[PDB]
């Protein structure tokens, strides 16, 4: 197909929850658009100063009405955070999908989904281990190597609670999490006009995504398959062993 000059503004809003293929999708959108896509990895590796800005935004977000003066202030901060990016995926952004749709009226919406039990299992190994899981101590040790402190964990928890619209949340309760998951995904498909939504099940690959976005399938490039919990476990253990990211980053080419 012909090469056309794409606008550097949010073109795709992904509502999918963490551990549903968001990093592969991030990589895929960057392969298509040749501009950055927002993701929790963007915060961790490139923009840790954003952490307090997202935390502030979530704090102020109860005061959003579907427009109040207070809404415009929030929308302005969201636009600021996302300047220069062509898409959003993952926490903390995914819970803001309705507001992003208002801010970027010409952006299309994605929902990444998968088997709820596979999701929970993945979440417990990477994002939200149970309190008494010994692996939690390893995650915390590796996170310190990355410069991540208590504020980072607060942002993760608060952004999840925001996505699920819960004032609080027993993170150690599998049944609660499974029910939030199903309710979240249900609500997205009820809220977004079907014309503006594409639901992507893990494994779907390039084809429905590229059709939805009116772009050619990238020539000779397989759809990304990254960020497995097995790989994240290896990253954690290597961070602990070497005590720096730059010592090991050559070992994790497409993940980081
Ligand atoms: N192209 C693909 N096909 C199948 N699974 C994929 C995939 N890309 C990512 N995944 C899976 O999606 C999860 C990562 O999601 P995220 O990037 O949102 O955190 C991982 O699940 P597992 O932890 O079960 O391996 C990963 O294996
Ligand atoms: C020990 C290291 C590997 N921990 C990985 C980092 C970096 C990867 C990571 C990703 C997410 C979600 O995309 C979350 N999260 O929302 O809790 C946390 C983290 N933490």
Numbering used by the authors: -1 to 64, 68 to 257
What do the paper's sentences say?
The resulting sulfate ester of OXA is an unstable species that spontaneously decays to form a reactive electrophilic product capable of alkylating DNA, proteins and other macromolecules.
The question of which or if both enantiomers are active, and which or if both can occupy the binding pocket of SmSULT is addressed in this report.
